[PDB]
Structure formats: structure tokens, C-alpha cells
Design an enzyme around this catalytic site. Structure first.
Site, PDB file in Angstrom:
ATOM      1  CB  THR A  29     -42.815  32.438   2.854  1.00 53.85           C
ATOM      2  OG1 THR A  29     -42.780  32.674   1.435  1.00 53.85           O
ATOM      3  CG2 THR A  29     -41.429  32.587   3.413  1.00 53.85           C
ATOM      4  CB  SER A  30     -47.644  32.061   5.067  1.00 53.44           C
ATOM      5  OG  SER A  30     -48.942  32.592   4.869  1.00 53.44           O
ATOM      6  CG  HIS A  88     -43.983  29.506  -2.710  1.00 55.98           C
ATOM      7  ND1 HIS A  88     -43.518  30.803  -2.753  1.00 55.98           N
ATOM      8  CD2 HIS A  88     -44.442  29.313  -1.450  1.00 55.98           C
ATOM      9  CE1 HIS A  88     -43.684  31.369  -1.569  1.00 55.98           C
ATOM     10  NE2 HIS A  88     -44.243  30.486  -0.761  1.00 55.98           N
ATOM     11  N   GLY A  89     -43.376  28.618  -6.982  1.00 57.13           N
ATOM     12  CA  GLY A  89     -42.987  27.870  -8.163  1.00 57.13           C
ATOM     13  C   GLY A  89     -41.517  28.011  -8.514  1.00 57.13           C
ATOM     14  CB  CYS A 130     -40.997  32.391  -8.401  1.00 59.85           C
ATOM     15  SG  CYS A 130     -41.236  33.787  -7.268  1.00 59.85           S
TER      16      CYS A 130
END
Ligand code: CL
Lengths: 232, 4, 232, 4
Positions: A29-30, A88-89, A130
Site C-alpha cells: 500500500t501507499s 514497509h518491512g 513492520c
């Protein structure tokens, strides 16, 4: 020799990698609110006298190339190095716009033996991402090449990290606030400990989805530092 | 509120 | 306020799990020097006014049972909790005498929602164990259930951890020394930072085996603490 | 010196 020498001519670089928009190949996601974070960090570290460089929407290749090039710079006149990763992660992983890269691949460039002008100097990696998909439901002659790193994670191993689309992420909101208030008063571990309390106590998720509602977060300080760190 |  | 309340009637328990001899079928070597560690820790935490319980050579089932039982005690009059694990290990794993158990399984018993009489109190896990096989060659209304844990690892993620058969492990040697010297003067994170420096600077492996000779170690502080921790 |  209990605290790092921070009176070099320059405090050092602060590299902010701000990944908001992700290619279709990854899904992802953005990350609404991340620009608020990037701006808050730029201003916060500007006030700490860092040479801030903001990078937006980098592929995993560009991230690796940027870190390589930065590690090949001459840091002799710099006290420290800061890298902020906004993306993100997953556990051990940060996302380029086009896919995952191992955090280890990024941080290795700055190993004591691979970036000699930062040897013995604090290398700070600040990670808003994350580290998994668990939710916290709440209650109530030589030195080691891995020495002098600090990894300030937004969340515990295995867990989601929360980002507000209007205010920015919980962790970066709190980190900038505590730096602004206490960088001229407290040692960095004590600043980060305040950040932990702020995130833990003042934030709780609100969601129309019961599964994601009323959740909590604790950040995760990982220190291989050998000295105390003061920004004044 | 969203997750990263 | 910014500090954990440490004037409950009791400082708390200090559980020391000392695994020296392993079942033959595991292929795990005897950990010569670990009794020096266990005795040093017992005395050090005695002086900090912890109720120390030493346990030796526990199977993985006994470790889990012990932790479950201890987590079910009433800790209302205790300021904190300390658990020290001395054993073989890999990343995320500690060895019972008969095989591995997940560290996450051990620490979960003390989650904020599972051990209510320790909610809001510092839970310290001190881990002398390898986290893999890398060698460092050196150079030159609610709170999160994961909050208020500190994990003091002897070594960086992915790395071996060193133990001297005569003197005890590098990390425990240094930890006890720094506690003895500074527990009356410094906040816990700053004590652990001194431990980091001591291990990184004063120790280097000596081996007839070139692969294992002249190697270095950096411990790894992992803090989800929300307040400063003082032993006075 | 030995490893754990
Ligand atoms: Cl290491």
C-alpha cells in the site's frame, strides 16, 4: 572516554529514505502520512546540526547503491552517521519500492572494517517499518566490526508497526518530539526510552475492523554502542 | 491508523 | 516518574539457569567455565538485593516448567524480575540439556497480560549463548504486552558467543564487574553500555585454530523498557 | 576460549 567524541567539525550525515509508493510487483500500500514523518525528521535533525539528505521512493537496488556510495564517502570530519528508513518491512527486511532487501545488506557497508572513516563512531539506524504481522492487544588493539551500531526499531520483533495517515507514524512522531524536547538534556538511550514510553502509553489504534482495533505498540532499542551519545 |  | 518504582518490599527474583552438562545424544559440548559465571552472578545479584535461585543442568521441559511456575508466583511485592540463561544456543534459541527451546516460549510467560503481578515492572533476561556461527574478526488505559522487557544478549545477532574455560564467559565476567562497580552510580542502560565497551575492547580469542583465533565480540542490548532502571 |  565514556561518551562518543561529538565535537568533530560536522555532526555527520542524516540520510532519510522515504518510501511512499510501491510498484505493482510487490503489492504494498501507499504509506499515507510518511511525508509528514520525512519532513519532521528533516527538521529535527537539521536542528541537531546534521547534514540531512532526503531520498524518496527508491528501488531496493537504489537503496543498496545509495548506502554503498555513502559508505565510500570520507567521514573523517564527521562525528557520527544517521540513516532513517521509512517503508514497509518484515523481520530483518526493508522494502525498496520494487521489493524486499535485507537490513543486513544495508548496514554491512558501515561495518567497522568496511567504512574506516566511521570506525569508532556511532552509526544510528532508525527504522519505521513492520517486523512481522503480529498485533499487540495490550493489557490493563581491535574492536568488533559490529560495534558502535544502534538500531532504533519502531516496533518489537514479529510485530506490525503503526502509521497514522494524517499525523505520521507513532514512532517517528514520538522520536522527533523527544529529540526536540530532550536532545540538549538527555543521553540518547534515555531519549529513546522516553520514546518507548510515549509510544506505549499515548497511542492506541482506532479501527472499524475489530481485528485491528485498540492495538498497542512498543518500539525496540537495539544497542551495540560502546559509549554514551549526547547531541550537545 | 494503518500498518506498515 | 521517568524511573521504575524500585522500592517495593523486594527487588524481585533472580533466576539463574546454568546449563553445563548436556545429554550425549545432543552432541553438545560441556560448557567449562559456566560455574564461574553462575557463582559470580549469584553474588552480584545478591548484593543488588535479589532473591537468587540457581538451577543447574535443566532439560528443555524443566526450563519451560520452571518459567511457567515462576510466572505463576505472586510478584506483587517485587519491583522487578531477572532471568539469566547460560547455555548453548542459536538465533532465538536456548538449549536445555536434551535439546533447544525457543526463547520466545520462555519470555512469553512473563507477558504483560500473562503475568499480571509483573505488569508495568522491568523484566530482565540476560542471555549467555551463541546466536549463530558468525565470527567477528575485528578491525584495527493499556500498555503493550511486550513492554518493559530488556534482553541483554552476550553477542550480536548471528554470531558466536565466547566463554573462557577458566575465567567464565566474556559477557558475564564484564556484566558482573560493571554491576559491582556502577550499580550505585549509573542507570542500567549506561551500565550495559560499559559492558559493551569492556567486552569489545579487553577481550580477544586465543586459539591454536586459525579459524577461531584473534576474534572479537560485541554484546547486544535489546530494550523495550519504558523507564529508567536504577538499582539504588 | 571456547564458543557457546
Ligand atoms: Cl559481532
Amino acid at each position: 572516554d565514556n561518551s562518543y567524541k561529538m565535537d568533530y567539525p560536522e555532526m555527520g550525515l542524516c540520510i532519510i529514505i522515504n518510501n511512499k509508493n510501491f510498484h505493482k510487483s510487490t503489492g504494498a500500500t501507499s504509506r499515507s502520512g510518511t511525508d509528514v514523518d520525512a519532513a519532521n525528521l528533516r527538521e529535527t535533525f537539521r536542528n541537531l546540526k546534521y547534514e540531512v539528505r532526503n531520498k524518496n521512493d527508491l528501488t531496493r537496488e537504489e537503496i543498496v547503491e545509495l548506502m554503498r556510495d555513502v559508505s565510500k564517502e570520507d567521514h573523517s570530519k564527521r562525528s557520527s552517521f544517521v540513516c532513517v528508513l521509512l517503508s514497509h518491512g518484515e523481520e530483518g527486511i526493508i522494502f525498496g519500492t520494487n521489493g524486499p532487501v535485507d537490513l543486513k545488506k544495508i548496514t554491512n557497508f558501515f561495518r567497522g572494517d568496511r567504512c574506516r572513516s566511521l570506525t569508532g563512531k556511532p552509526k544510528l539506524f532508525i527504522i519505521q517499518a513492520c517486523r512481522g504481522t503480529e498485533l499487540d492487544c495490550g493489557i490493563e588493539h581491535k574492536i568488533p566490526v559490529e560495534a558502535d551500531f544502534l538500531y532504533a526499531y519502531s516496533t518489537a520483533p514479529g510485530y506490525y508497526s503503526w502509521r497514522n495517515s494524517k499525523d505520521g507514524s507513532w514512532f517517528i512522531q514520538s522520536l522527533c518530539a523527544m529529540l526536540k524536547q530532550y536532545a540538549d538534556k538527555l543521553e540518547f538511550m534515555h531519549i529513546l526510552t522516553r520514546v518507548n514510553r510515549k509510544v506505549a502509553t499515548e497511542f492506541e489504534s482506532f479501527s472499524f475492523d475489530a481485528t485491528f482495533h485498540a492495538k498497542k505498540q512498543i518500539p525496540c532499542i537495539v544497542s551495540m554502542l560502546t559509549k554514551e551519545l549526547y547531541f550537545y | 491508523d494503518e500498518v506498515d
